[PDB]
Nucleic acid binder design. Structure first.
Ligand SMILES: [Mn+2]
Ligand SMILES: [Mn+2]
Ligand SMILES: [Mn+2]
Ligand SMILES: [Mn+2]
Lengths: 134, 134
DNA sequence: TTAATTGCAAATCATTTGCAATTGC
DNA sequence: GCAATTGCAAATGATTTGCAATTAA
């Protein structure tokens, strides 16, 4: 039983250490959007072998190899998730900072349209919605 | 002698100083979303009687009184004078240029998304990243 | 075998701040 | 004068890195 992230690391050629074994596990099982501090605590939980730097290094390695997506919702720290199958954007509840994920290709179309109407091709974007519940 | 951002500061009731008049002058001149370091380089141009540690306190204070709006783009805080109309940003991954835009449809699809998710939309961030069309 | 990974300081990068000097109003 | 405001320079917090030992292939 290898985590979906672990499998991707193997197929990419990466050396599989004990600490990389767990950090992959952690981020394959994380439903939310943990920060480096939290990915550490969760990894350090499943085995006290890992250090902080290893987690910083490993999460940067993964993001560079398109395994994780980085996020800077604006908390002073960077947050990560396992690269999903299809692109989604993020709805953030300004009351609890819990996160809802949405799609809407209609916006995605309009974005490309807006980029084209300025001389540009769209290489990347970032859409955060902030809202209170009813 | 007087600047638009300096007059907004005299009306708000702040103690006007040589540097704070210069920074108010520099920020009135620019329209390129300059970050703190850049504002420093453009500030000393008018009067070098300013140090780096104050540019922060000024740029932060201005943001407090709502003179400035803050953008933590996808990488160093950049700033601009509080626009009269809301807009998003198209950032050039090819150069320093940054393009301002409004798409009422997007703003409206945003609202529909918050609504159908049982949210009152209280804010949003949008940034598009483009290369010149090849 | 042997090049990549780890762990731990020490070192950044951007921003904040403690405090002695020093303005403004 | 007096409360507010500058200026270093030393703290800051989240991130990176240099280096010697370890470890995966
Ligand atoms: Mn999107
Ligand atoms: Mn997500
Ligand atoms: Mn918008
Ligand atoms: Mn703008």
């Amino acid at each position: 039983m290898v985590s979906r992230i672990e499998q991707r690391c193997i197929d990419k050629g990466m050396k599989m250490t004990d600490q990389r074994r767990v950090i992959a596990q952690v981020l394959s099982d994380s439903a939310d959007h943990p920060d480096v501090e939290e990915v550490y605590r969760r990894a350090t939980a499943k085995d006290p072998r890992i250090s902080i730097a290893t987690v910083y290094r490993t999460v940067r390695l993964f993001e560079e190899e398109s395994i994780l997506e980085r996020h800077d919702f604006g908390d002073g720290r960077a947050r990560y998730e396992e690269a999903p199958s299809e692109h989604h954007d993020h709805l953030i509840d300004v009351n609890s900072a819990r996160v809802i994920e949405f799609t809407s290709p209609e916006i995605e179309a309009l974005q490309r349209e807006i980029a084209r109407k300025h001389g540009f091709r769209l290489v990347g974007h970032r859409l955060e919605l902030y809202g209170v519940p009813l």
